[PDB]
Amino acid sequence: SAYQDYLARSRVGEGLALAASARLAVAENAASGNGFSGGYVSPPATRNVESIRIDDDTGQIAIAFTARVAAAGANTLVLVPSVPDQADTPTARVALSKGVIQAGTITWECFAGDKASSSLPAPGAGPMPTDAPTLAGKLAPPECRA
Numbered sequence: 601s602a603y604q605d606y607l608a609r610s611r612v613g614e615g616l617a618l619a620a621s622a623r624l625a626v627a628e629n630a631a632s633g634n635g636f637s638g639g640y641v642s643p644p645a646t647r648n649v650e651s652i653r654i655d656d657d658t659g660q661i662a663i664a665f666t667a668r669v670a671a672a673g674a675n676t677l678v679l680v681p682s683v684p685d686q687a688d689t690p691t692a693r694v695a696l697s698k699g700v701i702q703a704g705t706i707t708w709e710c711f712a713g714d715k716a717s718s719s720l721p722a723p724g725a726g727p728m729p730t731d732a733p734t735l736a737g738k739l740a741p742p743e744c745r746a
Contacts (some may be wrong), residue, residue, distance in 0.1 A: 608669050608739040611648040615663045618643050619652050626659040630702040659696045660730045678733040681706045682726035690723035710744035712737040
């Protein structure tokens with residue numbers, strides 16, 4: 601139902617906003633050449649957000665929502681980071697490189713369960729998720745959907 605959809609979408613948006621903490625930790629670790637999850641302490645769990653975690657190798661952020669939002673096994677949303685191949689007039693985006701000092705702006709792409717390819721402006725596609733998201737796209741912001 602549309603009202604049910606509203607409740608879930610609002611709570612998913614809040615989880616995405618809480619994940620700013622992880623986007624900042626990934627940026628800090630990229631700037632120091634550290635594993636991307638190093639030192640990250642996720643915010644307190646809420647009634648809506650079960651966990652926020654960072655993949656130490658790729659910087660991918662996975663947000664797991666509670667059953668108030670979506671069923672177990674259908675409850676994850678992912679954010680994938682990338683950087684341009686070169687800062688000046690890039691021709692492509694690339695996944696982050698663990699151990700390399702990377703201080704430029706990181707672009708984050710959201711993927712819900714239905715999204716089968718990257719959809720970004722120039723310089724083009726970013727990486728796909730490392731761990732597949734499972735949250736139904738209809739519950740996520742439109743930029744996360746197929």
